[PDB]
Amino acid sequence: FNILLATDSYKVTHYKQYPPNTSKVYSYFECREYEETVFYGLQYILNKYLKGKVVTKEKIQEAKDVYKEHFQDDVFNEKGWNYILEKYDGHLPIEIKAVPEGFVIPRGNVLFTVENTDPECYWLTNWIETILVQSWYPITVATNSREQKKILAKYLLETSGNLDGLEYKLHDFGYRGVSSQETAGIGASAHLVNFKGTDTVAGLALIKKYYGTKDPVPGYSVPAAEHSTITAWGKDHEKDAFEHIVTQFSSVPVSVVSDSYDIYNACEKIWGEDLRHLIVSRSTQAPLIIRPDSGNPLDTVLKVLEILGKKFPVTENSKGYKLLPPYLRVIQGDGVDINTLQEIVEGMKQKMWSIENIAFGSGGGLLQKLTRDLLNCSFKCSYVVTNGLGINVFKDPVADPNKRSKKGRLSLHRTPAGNFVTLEEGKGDLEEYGQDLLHTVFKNGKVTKSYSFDEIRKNAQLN
Amino acid sequence: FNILLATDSYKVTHYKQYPPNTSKVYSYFECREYEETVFYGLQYILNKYLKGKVVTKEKIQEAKDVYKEHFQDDVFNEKGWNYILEKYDGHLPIEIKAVPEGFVIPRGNVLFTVENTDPECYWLTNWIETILVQSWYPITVATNSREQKKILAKYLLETSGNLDGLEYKLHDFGYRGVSSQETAGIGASAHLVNFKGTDTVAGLALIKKYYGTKDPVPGYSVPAAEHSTITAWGKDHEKDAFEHIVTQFSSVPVSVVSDSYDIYNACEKIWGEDLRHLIVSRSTQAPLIIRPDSGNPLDTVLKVLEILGKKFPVTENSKGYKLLPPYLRVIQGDGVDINTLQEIVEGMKQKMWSIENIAFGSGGGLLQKLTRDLLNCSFKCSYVVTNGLGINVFKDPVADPNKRSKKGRLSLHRTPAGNFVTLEEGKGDLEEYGQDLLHTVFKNGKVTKSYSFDEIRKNAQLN
Ligand SMILES: CCNc1nc(-c2ccc(NC(=O)NCc3ccc(N)nc3)c(F)c2)ccc1C(=O)NCCN1CCCCC1
Ligand SMILES: CCNc1nc(-c2ccc(NC(=O)NCc3ccc(N)nc3)c(F)c2)ccc1C(=O)NCCN1CCCCC1
């Protein structure tokens, strides 16, 4: 990895565009204007890409050679990068302040700030904007995942009277559905801030190395079938496949995809009749989890439950909602996103089915179908010092008032009512709103403050 | 990187689910049912993750330790992995056949197949589905980018009479809008299959290391401003910032963001009057490229062109369309996706503006706002050998006919009319449709056939 080649191309030419005699460039990151966001992911970036000796004589030469052809011109700041190598032994003379990870903050507030600690490196601040802005991703995955948990908690509480098993109702099925291996790990780790279920193995290793947990692992899975393990037996032998699988995993929970040919026939005749004896004998610690995987998500779930309710003994919990026996559950993992999840639990409640009967799996909807525009994640310069005089800078496009950026030195505070407020123009300097909530997390090539994955989860809890 | 920890969790348990006495598992990839797709990206995966010695005693132990806790049970196939380590020195006993990279194939055709070469490793075929399926991303980026080139080619030819500069009309602005550094490199390289302009530097190194070009680099850029380099001068000094920037880059093309405060005032008064003398003097090889970055994309472009056409000498080309002077152009790089791009060129044409005047920049829309569902990318088992007998495998969900998979051994052929057809059930064996277009690209831990980035671009050319 070469940090000199890890920025938007045009940033290579910025050192020749700022006003002469500029000694400081101060910038901040915010989610402009999903009313609250979970701040998570910065720590990973600081350790993997920004800390330690990130500049070498060879990295400078390589960058120079690429840029010469890329621009068909010599515009690369070789002297500037050589200064960092010689003066700081390749360590970045930058200071980053940020809100603690796992913190849930309302939109339009400063989440972190970046600035240079050496006047010679005034151009460095925005050089690293590209790398830091990518924090939008783990922030968005964690936020959207937490919003789904809110919906699940509401309906589970209404239909059951408690939140037992909540942290297991949204399972990560997105490994193959993301853009890369690195994204898989970052995204899966962000989802684990809210839940404990994942099949995206890559997330475990990331958490262990960059955050850490008291427990051996932060996420869990159970044995389960895929279409290949069912269909390989032959069209006419779906029953033999089911029987063999549940027998191989008879003492632990097992998820079995049942829509290979006819989900309704499988539920009613196969599980419901032919193999019913191997199901009602299962332990409460090892239920069979039926998994449909096609058709209209809501219609399929409701019909599946109606069928099962007629083949198995259902009870009525204390809230008046129907409950399948303890050795039988369902997981809907097709076409699930924040919107369809809401429709399903609502539809279930209307038909008097408890949310305890179901769990949801989500792939593309959880880890891939998200953009930097969802939460309006933005990085902008708000303050500079030129000729020894600091000025508050900002943008304010006429055609879009929402793109208006904040001015001057920023700080985050608690309001008298216990809410959040971002003070601009160095006003935090006045002690009218108490202490600044941001903490220095990076300074001159070193990580100065960190959080365990356990603290992050605590910070991200629901009210 | 540990391949044993690079799969969907449940696949760790599949070796106990296949029918007993199974010696072969054969699977394929396709974009079910954007009528044609560009096949690209597999080579990167084969070299980075699948080739050479991918198994060690340490990797086996590491995987075992993680899985024991992840599943809270011992279900890991230690024996299976140890067999590969001792017998093939950690090399994968697998064979992958694929259509040449860059090839343009219609939907619903086999793109690549996977199978085990050793009977003991029948479970390996689908273990690596997760890694291989991620090819959906570079395939999708390349396909979506090519479809945008088609729109541009159509309108440019209509308004200008030719396609000069077409390969520079869609620029990659997505570096910060993607989910990770790795994705950035993959996505940027996929766009470069169709165009020559990028600011996502990461793509260059990926191409050079895994594919290669005759030229030094495959992508180019020009110096340009960002809001920070304009706003840092102070609200009242936007003109000073502009003057300084175009003067620092007086002999090469230069892109200048002009919507900091008022894009329309900037075009008409600043560029149009105050600094008009530094513009009209510019060389045809170094034009000023004005860049709006806010407001309704179509309304903004049209209004900017109307303003410029009144402050600078416009000519009427041989097609009757309006053309700005050679030292002046425009780039719309906000809110650009496949849909808005089409609305812009159509709006420009109705107003009699030539497409020569403009280029487009795209970030999230080009590299992030895409899913595995866009082209219905799917990997499925179509053939197995059990008890020495081969059988055709497939799924056919009752609620979704579109989810039906192909059966048996597959092969891709040219039709008599020069189109494409995928033969099922080993019917390719009969020599009725000529030669199979799929080639062995990987076998037993070695890449057997590779393509240069130059061949790939050639294969992906527009008709
Ligand atoms: C409603 C089900 N409940 C739960 N389901 C799961 C659960 C269900 C399914 C899968 N996997 C799966 O479907 N794999 C397919 C797949 C995999 C990858 C991919 N890419 N695509 C598809 C899984 F990993 C976990 C876990 C916990 C609970 C839960 O409630 N635990 C708390 C219960 N607790 C206290 C009471 C006594 C028992 C212990
Ligand atoms: C209509 C414009 N035409 C062209 N524009 C560009 C072009 C325009 C703008 C930018 N960069 C930019 O806006 N950067 C901002 C930015 C950066 C990152 C980020 N994340 N966000 C925003 C760029 F890199 C390239 C290139 C070639 C042509 C073209 O036509 N060349 C071939 C014709 N040419 C041949 C040689 C003789 C003269 C005629």
Swiss-Prot record, chains A, B:
Protein name: Nicotinamide phosphoribosyltransferase
A Pfam family matched in the record: NAPRTase
Effect caused by changing L156S: In a colorectal cancer sample; somatic mutation
Expressed in which tissues: Expressed in large amounts in bone marrow, liver tissue, and muscle. Also present in heart, placenta, lung, and kidney tissues.
GO biological process, one term: positive regulation of gene expression
InterPro entries reported for this sequence: Aldolase_TIM, DUF5598, N/Namide_PRibTrfase, Nicotinamide_PRibTrfase, Nicotinate_pribotase-like_C
Outcome when changing H227A: Reduces activity towards nicotinamide
CDD domains: PBEF_like
Stated regulation of activity: Inhibited by FK866. FK866 competes for the same binding site as nicotinamide, but due to its very low dissociation rate, it is essentially an irreversible inhibitor.
Organism: Homo sapiens (Human)
Modified residues (Phosphotyrosine): Y168
Function in brief: Catalyzes the condensation of nicotinamide with 5-phosphoribosyl-1-pyrophosphate to yield nicotinamide mononucleotide, an intermediate in the biosynthesis of NAD. It is the rate limiting component in the mammalian NAD biosynthesis pathway. The secreted form behaves both as a cytokine with immunomodulating properties and an adipokine with anti-diabetic properties, it has no enzymatic activity, partly because of lack of activation by ATP, which has a low level in extracellular space and plasma. Plays a role in the modulation of circadian clock function.
EC top class, as a word: transferase
GO MF assignments: cytokine activity; identical protein binding; nicotinamide phosphoribosyltransferase activity
